[PDB]
Coordinates of N, CA and C and ligand atoms in Angstrom, one line a residue:
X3 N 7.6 2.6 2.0 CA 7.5 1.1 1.6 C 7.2 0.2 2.7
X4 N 7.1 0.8 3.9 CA 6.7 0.0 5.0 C 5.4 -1.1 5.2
X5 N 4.6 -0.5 4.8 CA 3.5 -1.8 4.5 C 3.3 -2.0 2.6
X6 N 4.3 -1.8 1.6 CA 4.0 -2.7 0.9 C 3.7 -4.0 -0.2
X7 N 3.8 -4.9 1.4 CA 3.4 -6.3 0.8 C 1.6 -6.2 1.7
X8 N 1.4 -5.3 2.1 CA -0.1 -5.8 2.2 C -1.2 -5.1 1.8
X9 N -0.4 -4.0 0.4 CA -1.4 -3.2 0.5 C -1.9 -3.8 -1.0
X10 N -3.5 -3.5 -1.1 CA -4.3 -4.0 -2.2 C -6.1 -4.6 -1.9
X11 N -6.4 -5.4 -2.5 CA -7.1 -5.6 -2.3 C -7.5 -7.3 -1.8
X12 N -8.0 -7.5 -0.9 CA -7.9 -8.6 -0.2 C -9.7 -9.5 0.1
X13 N -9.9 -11.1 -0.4 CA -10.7 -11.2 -0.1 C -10.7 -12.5 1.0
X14 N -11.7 -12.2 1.9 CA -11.9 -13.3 3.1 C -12.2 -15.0 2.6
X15 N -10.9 -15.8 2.6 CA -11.1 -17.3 2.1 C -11.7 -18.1 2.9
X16 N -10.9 -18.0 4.3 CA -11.5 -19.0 5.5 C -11.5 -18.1 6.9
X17 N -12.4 -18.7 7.9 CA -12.5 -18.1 9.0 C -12.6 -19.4 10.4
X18 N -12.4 -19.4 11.1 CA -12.0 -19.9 12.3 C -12.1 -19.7 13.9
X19 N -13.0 -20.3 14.5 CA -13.2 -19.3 15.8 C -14.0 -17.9 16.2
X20 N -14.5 -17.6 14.9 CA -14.3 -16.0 15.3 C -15.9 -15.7 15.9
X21 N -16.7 -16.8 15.7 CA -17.9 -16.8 16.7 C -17.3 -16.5 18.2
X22 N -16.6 -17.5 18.6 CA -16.5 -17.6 19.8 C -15.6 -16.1 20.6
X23 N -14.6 -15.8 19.3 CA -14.0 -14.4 19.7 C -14.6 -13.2 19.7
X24 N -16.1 -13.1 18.9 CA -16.9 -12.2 19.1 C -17.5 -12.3 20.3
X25 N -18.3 -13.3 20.6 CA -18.8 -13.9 22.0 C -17.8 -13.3 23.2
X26 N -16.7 -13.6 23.1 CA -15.7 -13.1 24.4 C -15.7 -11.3 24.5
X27 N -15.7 -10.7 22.7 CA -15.7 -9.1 22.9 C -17.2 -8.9 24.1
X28 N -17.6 -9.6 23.6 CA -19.1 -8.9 24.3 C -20.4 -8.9 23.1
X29 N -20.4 -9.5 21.3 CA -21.5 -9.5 20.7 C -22.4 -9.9 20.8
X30 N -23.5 -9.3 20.7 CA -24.7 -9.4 20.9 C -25.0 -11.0 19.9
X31 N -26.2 -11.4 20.3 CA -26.8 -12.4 19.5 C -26.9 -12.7 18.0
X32 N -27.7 -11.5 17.3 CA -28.2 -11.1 15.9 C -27.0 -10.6 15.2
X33 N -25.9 -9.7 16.0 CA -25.1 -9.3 15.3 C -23.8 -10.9 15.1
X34 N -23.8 -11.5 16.3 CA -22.8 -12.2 15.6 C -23.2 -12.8 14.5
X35 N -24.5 -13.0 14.1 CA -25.0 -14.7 13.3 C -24.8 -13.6 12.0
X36 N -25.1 -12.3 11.8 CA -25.1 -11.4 10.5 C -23.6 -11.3 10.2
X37 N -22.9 -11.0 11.2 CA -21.4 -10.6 10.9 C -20.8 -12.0 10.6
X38 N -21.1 -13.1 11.2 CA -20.0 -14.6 10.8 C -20.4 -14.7 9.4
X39 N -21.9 -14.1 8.8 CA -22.1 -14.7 7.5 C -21.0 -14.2 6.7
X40 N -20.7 -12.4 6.7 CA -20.5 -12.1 5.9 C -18.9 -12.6 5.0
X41 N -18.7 -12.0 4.4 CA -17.2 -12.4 3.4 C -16.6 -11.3 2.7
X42 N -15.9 -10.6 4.2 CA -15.4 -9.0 3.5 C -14.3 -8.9 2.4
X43 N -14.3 -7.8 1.7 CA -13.2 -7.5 1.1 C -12.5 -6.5 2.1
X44 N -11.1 -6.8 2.3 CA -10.3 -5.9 3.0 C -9.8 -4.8 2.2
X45 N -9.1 -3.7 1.7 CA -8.7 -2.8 0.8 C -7.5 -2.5 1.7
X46 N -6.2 -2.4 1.6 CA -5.3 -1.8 2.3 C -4.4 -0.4 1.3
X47 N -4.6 0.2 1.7 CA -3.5 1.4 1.1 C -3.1 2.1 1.8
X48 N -1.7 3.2 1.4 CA -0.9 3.8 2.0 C -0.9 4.8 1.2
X49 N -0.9 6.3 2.0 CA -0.6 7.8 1.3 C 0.4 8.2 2.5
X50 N 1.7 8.4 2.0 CA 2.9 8.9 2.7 C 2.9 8.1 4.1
X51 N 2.4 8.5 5.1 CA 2.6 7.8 6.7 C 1.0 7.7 6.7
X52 N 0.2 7.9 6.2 CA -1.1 7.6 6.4 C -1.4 6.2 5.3
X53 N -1.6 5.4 6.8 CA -2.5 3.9 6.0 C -4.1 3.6 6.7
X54 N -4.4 3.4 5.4 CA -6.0 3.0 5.0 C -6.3 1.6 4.7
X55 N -7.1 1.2 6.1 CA -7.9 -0.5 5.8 C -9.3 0.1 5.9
X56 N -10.0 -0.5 4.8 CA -11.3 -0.6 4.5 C -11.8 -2.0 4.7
X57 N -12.9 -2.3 5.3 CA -13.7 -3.6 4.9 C -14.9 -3.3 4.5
X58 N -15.2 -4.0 3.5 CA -17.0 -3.9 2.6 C -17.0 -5.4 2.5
X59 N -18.2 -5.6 3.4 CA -19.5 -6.6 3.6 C -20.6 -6.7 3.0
X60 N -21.7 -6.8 3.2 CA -23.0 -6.9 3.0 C -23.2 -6.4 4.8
X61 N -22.4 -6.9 5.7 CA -22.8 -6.8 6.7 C -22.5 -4.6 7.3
X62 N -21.4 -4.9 7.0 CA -21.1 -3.2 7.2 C -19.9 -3.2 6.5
X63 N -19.8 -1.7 6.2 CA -18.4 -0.8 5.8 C -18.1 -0.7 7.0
X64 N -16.6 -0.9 7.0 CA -15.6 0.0 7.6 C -14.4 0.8 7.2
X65 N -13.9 1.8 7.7 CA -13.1 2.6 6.9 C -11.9 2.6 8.3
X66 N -10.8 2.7 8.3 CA -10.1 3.6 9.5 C -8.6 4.1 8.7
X67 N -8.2 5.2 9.1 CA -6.7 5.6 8.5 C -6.2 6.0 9.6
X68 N -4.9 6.0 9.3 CA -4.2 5.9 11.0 C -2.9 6.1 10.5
X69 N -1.9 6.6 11.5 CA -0.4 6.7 11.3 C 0.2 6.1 12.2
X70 N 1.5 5.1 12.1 CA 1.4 4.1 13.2 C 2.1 4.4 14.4
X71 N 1.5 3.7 15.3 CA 2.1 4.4 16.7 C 1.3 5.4 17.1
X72 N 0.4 6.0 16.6 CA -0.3 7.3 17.3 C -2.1 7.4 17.3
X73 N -2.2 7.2 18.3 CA -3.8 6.6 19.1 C -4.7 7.4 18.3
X74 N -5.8 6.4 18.0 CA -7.1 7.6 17.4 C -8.5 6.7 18.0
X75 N -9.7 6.9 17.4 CA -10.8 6.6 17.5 C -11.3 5.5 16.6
X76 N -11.6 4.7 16.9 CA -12.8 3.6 16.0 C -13.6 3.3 16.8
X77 N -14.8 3.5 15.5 CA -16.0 2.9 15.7 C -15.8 1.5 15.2
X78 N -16.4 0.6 16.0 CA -16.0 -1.0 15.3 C -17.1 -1.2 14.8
X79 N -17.3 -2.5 13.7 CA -18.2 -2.9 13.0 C -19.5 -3.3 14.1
X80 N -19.3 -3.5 15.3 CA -20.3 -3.9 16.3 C -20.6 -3.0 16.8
X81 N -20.6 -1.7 16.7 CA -20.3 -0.5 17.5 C -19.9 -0.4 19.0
X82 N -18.9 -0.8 18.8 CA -17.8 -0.7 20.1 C -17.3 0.8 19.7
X83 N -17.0 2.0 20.8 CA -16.2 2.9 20.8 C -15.2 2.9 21.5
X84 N -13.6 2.4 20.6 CA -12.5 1.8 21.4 C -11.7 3.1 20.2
X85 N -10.3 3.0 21.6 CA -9.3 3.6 20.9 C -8.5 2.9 20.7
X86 N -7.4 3.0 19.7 CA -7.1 2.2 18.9 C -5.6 2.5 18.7
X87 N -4.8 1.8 18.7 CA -2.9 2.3 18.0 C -2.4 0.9 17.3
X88 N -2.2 1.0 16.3 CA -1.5 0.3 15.6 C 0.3 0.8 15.3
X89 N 1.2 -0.5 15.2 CA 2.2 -0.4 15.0 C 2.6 -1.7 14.4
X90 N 3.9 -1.7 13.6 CA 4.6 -2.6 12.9 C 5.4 -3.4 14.0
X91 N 5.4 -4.6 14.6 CA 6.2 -5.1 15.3 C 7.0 -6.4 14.3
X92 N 8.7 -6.5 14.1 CA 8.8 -7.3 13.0 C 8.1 -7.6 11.6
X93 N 7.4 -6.9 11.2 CA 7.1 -7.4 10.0 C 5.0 -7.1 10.0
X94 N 4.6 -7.3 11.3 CA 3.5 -7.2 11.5 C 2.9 -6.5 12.1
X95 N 1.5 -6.3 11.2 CA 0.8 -5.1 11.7 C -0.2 -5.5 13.2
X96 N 0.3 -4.4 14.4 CA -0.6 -5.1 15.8 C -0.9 -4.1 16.1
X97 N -2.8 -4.4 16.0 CA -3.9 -3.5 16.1 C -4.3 -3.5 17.5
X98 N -4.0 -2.6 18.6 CA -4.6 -2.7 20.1 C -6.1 -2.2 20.1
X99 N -7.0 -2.7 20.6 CA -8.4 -1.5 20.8 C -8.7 -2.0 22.0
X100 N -8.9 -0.8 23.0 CA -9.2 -0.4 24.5 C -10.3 0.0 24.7
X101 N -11.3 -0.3 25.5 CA -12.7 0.4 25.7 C -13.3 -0.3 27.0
X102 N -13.8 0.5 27.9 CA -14.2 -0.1 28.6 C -13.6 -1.4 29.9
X103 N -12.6 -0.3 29.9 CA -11.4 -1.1 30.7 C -10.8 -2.7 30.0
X104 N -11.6 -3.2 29.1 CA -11.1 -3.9 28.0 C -9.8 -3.6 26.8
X105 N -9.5 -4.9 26.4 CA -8.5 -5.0 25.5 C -9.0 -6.1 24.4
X106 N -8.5 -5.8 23.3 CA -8.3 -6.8 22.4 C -7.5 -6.4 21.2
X107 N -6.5 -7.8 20.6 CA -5.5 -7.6 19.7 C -5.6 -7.8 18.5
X108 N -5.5 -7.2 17.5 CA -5.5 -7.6 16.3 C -4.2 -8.2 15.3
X109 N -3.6 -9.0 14.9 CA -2.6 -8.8 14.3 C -2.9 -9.2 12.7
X110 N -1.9 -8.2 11.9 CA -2.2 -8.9 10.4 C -1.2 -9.3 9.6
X111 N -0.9 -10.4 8.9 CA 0.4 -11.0 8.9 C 0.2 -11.2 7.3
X112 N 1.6 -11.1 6.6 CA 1.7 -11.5 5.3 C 2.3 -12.7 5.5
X113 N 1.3 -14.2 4.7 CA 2.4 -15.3 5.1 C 2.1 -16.0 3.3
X114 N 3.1 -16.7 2.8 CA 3.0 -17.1 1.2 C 2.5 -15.7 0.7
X115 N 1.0 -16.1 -0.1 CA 0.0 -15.0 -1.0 C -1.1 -15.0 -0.2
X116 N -1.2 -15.0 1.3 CA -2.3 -14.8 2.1 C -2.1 -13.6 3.2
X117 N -3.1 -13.1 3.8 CA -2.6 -12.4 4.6 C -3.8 -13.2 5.6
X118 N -2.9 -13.3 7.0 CA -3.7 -13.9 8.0 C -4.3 -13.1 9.0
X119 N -5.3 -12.9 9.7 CA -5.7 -11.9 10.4 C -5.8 -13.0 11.8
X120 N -5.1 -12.2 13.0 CA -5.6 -13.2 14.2 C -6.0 -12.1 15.1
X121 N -6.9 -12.9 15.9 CA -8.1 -11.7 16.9 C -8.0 -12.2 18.0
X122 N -7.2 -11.7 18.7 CA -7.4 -12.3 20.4 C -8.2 -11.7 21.1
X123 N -8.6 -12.2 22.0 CA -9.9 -11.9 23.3 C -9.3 -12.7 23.9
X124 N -8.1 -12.2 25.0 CA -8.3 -13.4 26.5 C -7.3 -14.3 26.1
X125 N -8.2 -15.5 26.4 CA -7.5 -16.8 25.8 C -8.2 -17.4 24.3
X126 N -9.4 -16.2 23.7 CA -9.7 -16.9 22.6 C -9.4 -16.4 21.4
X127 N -9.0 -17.1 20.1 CA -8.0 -16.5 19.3 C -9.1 -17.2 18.2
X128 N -9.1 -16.0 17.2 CA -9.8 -16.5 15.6 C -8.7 -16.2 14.7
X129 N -8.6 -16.5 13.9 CA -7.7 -16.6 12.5 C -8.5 -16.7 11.0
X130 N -8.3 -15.7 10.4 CA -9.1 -15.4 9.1 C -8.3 -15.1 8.2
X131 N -8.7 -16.0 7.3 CA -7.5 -15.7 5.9 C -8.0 -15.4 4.5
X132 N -7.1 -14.1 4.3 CA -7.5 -13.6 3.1 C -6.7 -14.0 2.0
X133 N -7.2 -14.3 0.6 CA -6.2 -14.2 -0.3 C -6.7 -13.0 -1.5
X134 N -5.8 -12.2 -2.4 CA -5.8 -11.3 -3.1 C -7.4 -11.4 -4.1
X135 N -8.2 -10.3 -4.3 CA -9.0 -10.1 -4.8 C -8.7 -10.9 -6.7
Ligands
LIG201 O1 -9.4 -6.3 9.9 C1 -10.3 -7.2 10.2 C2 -10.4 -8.4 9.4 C3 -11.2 -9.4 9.8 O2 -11.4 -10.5 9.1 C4 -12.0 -9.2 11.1 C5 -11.7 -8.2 12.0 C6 -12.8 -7.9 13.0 C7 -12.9 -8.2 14.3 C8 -14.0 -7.9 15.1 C9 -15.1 -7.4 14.5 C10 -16.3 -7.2 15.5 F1 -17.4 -6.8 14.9 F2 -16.6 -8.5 16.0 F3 -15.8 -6.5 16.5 C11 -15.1 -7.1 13.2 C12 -14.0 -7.3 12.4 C13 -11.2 -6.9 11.3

């Protein structure tokens, strides 16, 4: 029962920043103006210690399943090849991805009937909020 209040299906309401937090990863030109358009559906589910986030775009699918606390591979939507550990800290899910002697954080937060996503790079931080499909 560990993740759920966030498992379901999730759609992208507002976004914030997240030009500028792509820009700090390192995105190319064409990809950020394609990726800011899009307006993903997130999908979250859980099978026993294995959880599943999906995002479907127009821009790209992504898929990753993971068990928390124990490092694996992603391909990111920009094709970054970072490794990746997520874990529960108080209540929240915090996504590390490493590559390239780089870092960046993800965290995903249940707050009311939204779930907030925030993306650090550095000092630049985007905030994207989903509410239920
Ligand atoms: O779970 C998530 C929910 C979001 O709203 C966005 C996050 C994201 C960050 C970065 C990228 C990029 F392509 F920029 F790396 C793609 C997606 C992933």
């Amino acid at each position: 029962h560990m993740c759920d209040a966030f498992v379901g299906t999730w759609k992208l309401v507002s976004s914030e920043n997240f030009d500028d937090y792509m820009k700090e990863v390192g995105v190319g030109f064409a990809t950020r103006k394609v990726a800011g358009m899009a307006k993903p559906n997130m999908i979250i589910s859980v099978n026993g210690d294995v959880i599943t986030i999906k995002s479907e775009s127009t821009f790209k699918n992504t898929e990753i399943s993971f068990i928390l606390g124990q490092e694996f591979d992603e391909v990111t939507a920009d094709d970054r090849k970072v490794k990746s550990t997520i874990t529960l800290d108080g209540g929240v899910l915090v996504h590390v991805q490493k590559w390239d002697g780089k870092s960046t954080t993800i965290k995903r937060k249940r707050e009311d009937d939204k779930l907030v996503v925030e993306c650090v790079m550095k000092g630049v931080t985007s905030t994207r909020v989903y509410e239920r499909a």
